[PDB]
Design an enzyme around this catalytic site. Structure first.
Site, mmCIF file in Angstrom:
data_model
loop_
_atom_site.group_PDB
_atom_site.id
_atom_site.type_symbol
_atom_site.label_atom_id
_atom_site.label_comp_id
_atom_site.label_asym_id
_atom_site.label_seq_id
_atom_site.Cartn_x
_atom_site.Cartn_y
_atom_site.Cartn_z
ATOM 1 N N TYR A 137 -29.931 -17.632 -48.546
ATOM 2 C CA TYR A 137 -30.621 -17.913 -49.527
ATOM 3 C C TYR A 137 -31.225 -17.476 -50.337
ATOM 4 C CZ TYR A 137 -28.375 -22.736 -50.877
ATOM 5 O OH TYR A 137 -27.886 -23.844 -52.038
ATOM 6 N N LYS A 175 -27.569 -22.102 -35.799
ATOM 7 C CA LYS A 175 -25.978 -21.096 -35.257
ATOM 8 C C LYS A 175 -26.850 -20.365 -34.700
ATOM 9 C CE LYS A 175 -21.196 -20.855 -35.012
ATOM 10 N NZ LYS A 175 -21.363 -21.301 -34.254
ATOM 11 N N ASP A 199 -22.062 -26.485 -35.993
ATOM 12 C CA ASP A 199 -21.140 -26.558 -36.060
ATOM 13 C C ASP A 199 -20.853 -27.731 -35.555
ATOM 14 O OD1 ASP A 199 -21.311 -24.602 -33.766
ATOM 15 O OD2 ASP A 199 -19.327 -23.743 -33.653
ATOM 16 N N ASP A 205 -28.813 -27.061 -46.728
ATOM 17 C CA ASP A 205 -27.892 -27.668 -48.044
ATOM 18 C C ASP A 205 -27.202 -27.821 -47.214
ATOM 19 O OD1 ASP A 205 -26.593 -27.535 -50.635
ATOM 20 O OD2 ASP A 205 -26.105 -26.190 -50.169
#
Lengths: 416, 416
Positions: free
Chosen positions: A160, A230, A283, A307
């Site tokens: 980002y 992740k 996830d 986000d």
């Protein structure tokens, strides 16, 4: 060109001493109107906040709002190409607390997100997004009331951050050559006509974010802090964030192993409560917030994942348009409407001012004016329960009274 | 050490001619049992598939299953450290179609995801995840029946590719130095104790994935293809994926502007139907699948976003444990259970075999044995509607008959 900002005659600047805000009875608060519907929602927010302050402190306190600029209006005020004036960064840092409506970043001129620019330039490393359900809100899920979380999203690093090179550009080729030739990278499937992005994650960036999350859990007696990442695929960025987060809990907060791990228990120094520090793969987390929302409370995660998570959670509680948000750093803080500019409705006094109003609630709370903040929450809860709402809510229910944006602001005040 | 794979005496190998599978009446199909609950779900799948094939073609066709290895069992068969034997990659490519249970990748030995290794080594660039609701399935949302999507997730590039260096490693420092010194990067907030990941996105990788998505929409008469990306922040990777996707629709499928854009209409050559090609920013998309699921159909996206999206969608329809998946390339395809290994239940004949069974349905369909595939869907629909289900479903409903894993396989056959 002269500055067009007018410092309020009455009004005093907030100061910071020993990392603690010293707020006068008459603080000057800079505000950015915002593009598009900011023209509708900001005035509703100014009125609602003034009413809450007036009611809580019986006239003893009063905010001296000072309009500052960024976005489309800035170009209108300071001229073509002035999308983010230096004075705006200076003023937010100087006055310590500010608020903004939605901003639009132009396309076609190579300008990157103005929201991200504000966060990076001011080093507002915490993006704070609390998500709860307001009884009476139309929601797509069966039990939105089970959701009550606070997201601490790292705001200064990750992909980002905007470090990337365009496919076929001389720079991209140079970088890919270095990677393949000097770094021995074999995993780029197609090295030709290939764009490249860089994802950084540091120990210092991770720990200042997680430290803030744990201090918040302690200060607000929350039940747990979940590190979402992740890490099973991105071992050195996402996985490092998780590792450093648990390490910080151990080194600074006395976290100790629960059973055989990996979870830790941190004792709340004020309540003696044991706060659980755990982690969930990102996830799986997007599934868990839907299936077992009650098991989560404070969340700490990286920029991109935050986000997604904060947007997914807002949608599930029916709060896509009333989700509050803050960008907080060590020297200043910028509260913000979290939705977009919705230009099609701009100027129609139609949209929901709830997001910027609740961000103002967070602002008042940040200032230590918790009584005024409590009155806004009360007002929001009563107006929504009364089913006297804007079209975005009304269109999803039966028996509602449709109100204009401005009218919903009054309904909130009427319910204080 | 000799190979321990035994090629079936009866049985013939599937061949590929002009990009079209030539499937015998007696195909040899390699299968990986899978770690943990694979021991429970794979046999249920073998039985259910054999029954569907037997019933559809009245004995004219029959699969000759051939067990091959990867994961914990591979180390048990080929010795310590043989987590993914070369013969397994060779055999999947040679026999063209294969299926696997869940796999476990060990921690502490620097081995990366075995699932990703299979996908990358075999160049299975399409991760295909169809998500629909099965009437009677307990779901956390109010209208799961509105969800009927097919996700085409790019499987060979993105940050998911594993190019990264550990914080404080000599390699990370070298890369950061090059970035700061030779590339003039100013945006790394904390360059010390900083991990670094690389995110590649190429024109060729993007277009082969989107081409497959559009051909699928055409072949199955779907209504639209939505390019999901985070291009407003990652302009050169995510934004390039979106740009190349629309470009491909224009250049290869005659896409034309709808109104003033940005959407395109592609005419279905077989039905004359106009397929809409549109795009949605990824964070907004995670809200849209909950709020306006009926507006989406075929989805094309990058590796990481696809992982999140497919998991979020499966959860919403109550399908976290029965979500099918395929990894497809130009020379072969590997179908897979999409959940994890759940070692706590392994060997208890308790878990839901629905995911691997529906992945087998996709496999049969891929082989052109659509009648057998239709019988599995029918069987799955009837067993779930009958409320004769495994504990993961049963525990969420009233009036259900609890079945063992093996028993649920029979229930599916009983409902064919």
């Amino acid at each position: 060109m002269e500055s067009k900002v007018v410092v309020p005659a009455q009004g005093k600047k907030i100061t910071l001493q020993n990392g603690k805000l010293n707020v006068p009875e008459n603080p000057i608060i800079p505000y950015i109107e915002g593009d598009g519907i900011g023209v509708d929602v900001t005035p509703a927010m100014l009125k609602v906040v003034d009413a809450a302050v007036e009611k809580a402190y019986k006239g003893e306190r009063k905010i001296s709002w000072m309009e500052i600029y960024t976005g489309e209006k800035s170009t209108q005020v300071y001229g073509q190409d002035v999308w983010l004036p230096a004075e705006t960064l200076d003023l937010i840092r100087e006055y310590r607390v500010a608020i903004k409506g939605p901003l639009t970043t132009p396309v076609g001129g190579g300008i990157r997100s103005l929201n991200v620019a504000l966060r990076q330039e001011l080093d507002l490393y915490i993006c704070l997004r609390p998500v709860r359900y307001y009884q009476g809100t139309p929601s797509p899920v069966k039990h939105p009331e089970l959701t009550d979380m606070v997201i601490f999203r790292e705001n200064s690093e990750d992909i980002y951050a905007g470090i990337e090179w365009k496919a076929d550009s001389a720079d991209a080729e140079k970088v890919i050559k270095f990677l393949r030739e000097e770094m021995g990278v074999k995993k780029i499937r197609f090295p030709e006509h290939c764009g490249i992005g860089i994802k950084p994650c540091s120990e210092e960036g991770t720990k200042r974010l997680v430290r803030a999350a744990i201090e918040y859990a302690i200060a607000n007696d929350r039940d747990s802090v979940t590190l979402v990442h992740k890490g099973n695929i991105m071992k050195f960025t996402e996985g490092a964030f998780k590792d450093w987060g648990y390490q910080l809990a151990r080194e600074e907060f006395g976290g100790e192993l629960i059973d055989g791990g990996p979870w830790l228990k941190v004792k709340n120094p004020n309540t003696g409560k044991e706060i659980v520090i755990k982690d969930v793969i990102a996830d799986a987390f997007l599934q868990q917030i839907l299936l077992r929302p009650a098991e989560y409370d404070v969340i700490a995660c990286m920029n991109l994942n935050g986000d997604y998570i904060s947007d997914a959670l807002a949608a599930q509680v029916g709060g896509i348009g009333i989700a509050p948000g803050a960008n907080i750093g060590d020297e200043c803080a910028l509260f913000e409407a979290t939705h977009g500019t919705a230009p099609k409705y701009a100027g129609q006094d139609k949209v929901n001012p709830g997001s910027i109003i609740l961000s103002a609630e967070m602002m008042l709370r940040h200032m230590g004016w918790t009584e005024a903040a409590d009155l806004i929450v009360k007002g929001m809860e009563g107006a929504i329960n009364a089913k006297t709402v804007t079209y975005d809510f009304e269109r999803l229910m039966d028996g509602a009274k449709l109100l204009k944006c401005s009218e919903f602001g009054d309904a909130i005040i009427e319910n204080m």
